[PDB]
Design a protein around this ligand. Sequence first.
Ligand SMILES: [Cu+]
Length: 69
Amino acid sequence: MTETDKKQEQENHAECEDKPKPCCVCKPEKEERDTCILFNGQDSEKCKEFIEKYKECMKGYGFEVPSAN
Ligand SMILES: [Cu+]
């Protein structure tokens, strides 16, 4: 029995989905980032500051991050 379509593609937003399985070691900074982008609008320094601080606090004895390298 054949079929027209079934397999879903599902693409990403821009590039690199990031975020593996954010365990319990990561939660507060996450809320701080969301709030920062909520009030600001990501139009403030691109909020890259929180991204770097996060990747810096996680890549070092933190947990795990896929990234795009
Ligand atoms: Cu975590």
